[PDB]
Write a protein that binds this DNA or RNA. Structure first.
Ligand SMILES: [Cl-]
Ligand SMILES: [Mg+2]
Ligand SMILES: [Mg+2]
Ligand code: NA
Length: 328
DNA sequence: CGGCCTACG
DNA sequence: CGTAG
DNA sequence: GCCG
C-alpha cells in the first residue's frame, strides 16, 4: 500500500498529518544533534510516510503495516492521538541541549560538531559566541553578524527580484547562460531560508570558469555581503532590498554543464530526504550510483545520458514526480 | 547483523 | 571542518 | 530506529 522509499510516492508540501510529522521531526533533529544518523533517518522517514498519506491518522490501527513505524515511532503517535502531546518530544523541546544545539547549528558556518564542542565548553547563547571572536572563522563571524536577518524567511516575491539581478550579472558574464530557480521554491514553497539558483549554458563547455565571473560582477554591484572568494558552487549572503532599507539573505549559486543539468536540477530541487532516498534506491535497488553530476552503471562503467528529469526517473524505473511532489 | 547519499569549498 | 539538497 |  505504501512503498518503503520516499522517492516511490508523491509527497505534497501540505498534507493531513502536520502535527504528527512535526513531532517525529523533533526527534529526528535531536538524534542528529547526538550524532545518531540512523535514528535521524528512521524518524525522518516515518514523518515523511505520514506526509504521503491521503487523510489524517486518527487511530493507532492505521499505522499497521506502514513502513518505518515500529515500537518507538508508533508510541509517539499513540501519545499524540491520546493526549495531544508526547512526553519525550516535549522533554526534548524544553531541553537546554536541544535548544542550544538548534540555535548554534542555525548559524551559517557552524555544524553539529562545532556546536557540540561549544556546548561542552559551556557556551549557550549567541552573545556568548560574540564575546570570544577568537574562536570564530570568517564564515562564522558573517553567520553570527547576519543571524537575525537570516532567521527571517524569504518570500517568493523576494525571489523573483533576486533572480533578475542574478540574471543581469550572468548575462554579462556569459551571454546565453540561463538561471533556473531550484530548492524549496521550485517545490512550491511560498517562503524559505535561502534561495537556490542553477546556472548553465546551452553550448557544452561554455560554462567552464563561469561562477567566478558571476560572483565578481555581483560583488561589483554591491550586492554581496559575504562569499568565500576555480569553483562551481557559491554559498553567499546577498543584500535584498526592503522598503527604505534591505536585509541579508542566503543565496546559493551552482553551475553545471548542460549535459549534467538534469542531474543537478534533480539534486538541487530536493527535498534533502527525497534525494537521499533516491540515491539509496538507485544504488540498493537498481545497482546504479546517482549524484548531482550523473548516474553511473558500475558494471558497464558507463554514465546515463539524460536530457530531462523525466529521463532520470525512467532510467531508475520510478514513476515521475514533479517537484511539488518531492516534499519528502 | 550491516546499512543508512554523495558530492564540493 | 564547513556547505548543499 | 527500523529494514531486509
Ligand atoms: Cl543512530
Ligand atoms: Mg533552499
Ligand atoms: Mg540553499
Ligand atoms: Na549551520
Amino acid at each position: 500500500w505504501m512503498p518503503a522509499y520516499a522517492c516511490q510516492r508523491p509527497t505534497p508540501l501540505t498534507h493531513h498529518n502536520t502535527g504528527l510529522s512535526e513531532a517525529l521531526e523533533i526527534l529526528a533533529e535531536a538524534a542528529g544533534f547526538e550524532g545518531s544518523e540512523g535514528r535521524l533517518l528512521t524518524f525522518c522517514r516515518a514523518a515523511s510516510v505520514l506526509k504521503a498519506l491521503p487523510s489524517p491518522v486518527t487511530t493507532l490501527s492505521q499505522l499497521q503495516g506502514l513502513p518505518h513505524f515500529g515500537e518507538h515511532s508508533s508510541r509517539v503517535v499513540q501519545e499524540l492521538l491520546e493526549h495531544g502531546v508526547c512526553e519525550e518530544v516535549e522533554r526534548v523541546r524544553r531541553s537546554e541541549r536541544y535548544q542550544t544545539m538548534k540555535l548554534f547549528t542555525q548559524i551559517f558556518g557552524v555544524g553539529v560538531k562545532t556546536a557540540d564542542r561549544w556546548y561542552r565548553e559551556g557556551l549557550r547563547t549567541l552573545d556568548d559566541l560574540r564575546e570570544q571572536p577568537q574562536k570564530l572563522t570568517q564564515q562564522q563571524k558573517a553567520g553570527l553578524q547576519h543571524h537575525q536577518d537570516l532567521s527571517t524567511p524569504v518570500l517568493r516575491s523576494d525571489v523573483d527580484a533576486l533572480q533578475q539581478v542574478v540574471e543581469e550579472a550572468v548575462g554579462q558574464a556569459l551571454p546565453g547562460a540561463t538561471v533556473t530557480l531550484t530548492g524549496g521554491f521550485r517545490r512550491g514553497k511560498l517562503q524559505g531560508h535561502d534561495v537556490d539558483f542553477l546556472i548553465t549554458h546551452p553550448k557544452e563547455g561554455q560554462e567552464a570558469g563561469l561562477l567566478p565571473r558571476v560572483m565578481c560582477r555581483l560583488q561589483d554591484q554591491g550586492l554581496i555581503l559575504y562569499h568565500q572568494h576555480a569553483f562551481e558552487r557559491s554559498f553567499c549572503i546577498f543584500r535584498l532590498p526592503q522598503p527604505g532599507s534591505w536585509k541579508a539573505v542566503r543565496v546559493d549559486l551552482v553551475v553545471a554543464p548542460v549535459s549534467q543539468f538534469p542531474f543537478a536540477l534533480l539534486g538541487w530541487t530536493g527535498s534533502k530526504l527525497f534525494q537521499r532516498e533516491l540515491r539509496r534506491f538507485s544504488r540498493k535497488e537498481k545497482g546504479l550510483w546517482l549524484n548531482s553530476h550523473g548516474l553511473f552503471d558500475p558494471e558497464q562503467k558507463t554514465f546515463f545520458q539524460a536530457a530531462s528529469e523525466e529521463d532520470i526517473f525512467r532510467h531508475l524505473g520510478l514513476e515521475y514526480l514533479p517537484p511539488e511532489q518531492r516534499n519528502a
